[PDB]
């Protein structure tokens, strides 16, 4: 319950937040990965999708934030929940994050990688 309410607070407040504060805000957020609650991880991924869209465009704190968000997204790209896996795939497979051109799609997805996935 506290997890969910905290994450909802975060999701509501992020648009006003400055990137510099957002950095050390997210640093203790990232641990809800592997947490055994689909609600927690899904709110996580909502936050991360927002960050990715709002930071794929500077501020080195923001740059590292974006890198970390993409990394944890890749982390999520393996789940115990097939539904989470599907929805995050749809997010990633979407054109803005996977170029419509198959050549460009492949070229972009080449970057997306972790030595854990």
């Amino acid at each position: 319950e506290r997890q969910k309410v905290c994450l909802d607070i975060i999701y509501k407040m992020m648009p006003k937040l400055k990137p510099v504060e957002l950095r050390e805000l997210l640093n203790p957020v990232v641990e809800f990965v592997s947490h055994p609650s689909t609600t927690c991880r899904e709110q996580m991924y909502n936050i991360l999708m927002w960050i990715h869209d709002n930071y794929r465009d500077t501020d080195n704190d923001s740059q590292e934030i974006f890198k970390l968000a993409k990394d944890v997204l890749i982390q999520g790209l393996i789940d115990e929940n097939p539904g989470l896996q599907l929805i995050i795939r749809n997010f990633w497979s979407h054109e803005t994050r996977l170029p419509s051109n198959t050549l460009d799609r492949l070229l972009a997805l080449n970057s997306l990688y972790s030595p854990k996935i």
Binding site: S100, N101, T102, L103
Partner: protein, 109 residues
């Protein structure tokens, strides 16, 4: 099951276990990659010779744990043989060696 199986295997001693594995029996069954297939897209149609999957896709479809895996493999095998026998309509020994390879597998399955 698999844990006990590997346990038994090591229990035997490798001098028996190496019997798990001459002409070496891999010659790239058909000299020609006669399984051409251009995958659909919106910009291009890269061609795939599904030949390479043949042995693999058979053996997994022949024997495998994880009933899900085996069912998926054999369904895809059904689809691919369906296609190739559709592809038999072609220029006039088309998949003669391929038939030799596949028919015993098909009948056992």
């Amino acid at each position: 099951i698999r844990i006990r199986v590997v346990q038994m295997l090591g229990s035997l001693g490798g001098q028996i276990n190496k019997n798990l594995l001459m002409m070496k029996s891999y010659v790239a069954w058909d000299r020609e990659k006669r399984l051409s297939f251009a995958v659909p897209f919106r910009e291009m149609k890269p061609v795939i010779f599904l030949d390479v999957f043949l042995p693999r896709v058979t053996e997994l479809a022949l024997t495998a744990s994880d009933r899900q895996t085996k069912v998926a493999a054999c369904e895809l095998l059904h689809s691919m043989v369906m296609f190739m026998l559709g592809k038999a309509t072609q220029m006039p020994p088309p998949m003669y060696q391929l038939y030799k390879r596949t028919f015993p597998v098909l009948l056992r399955l």
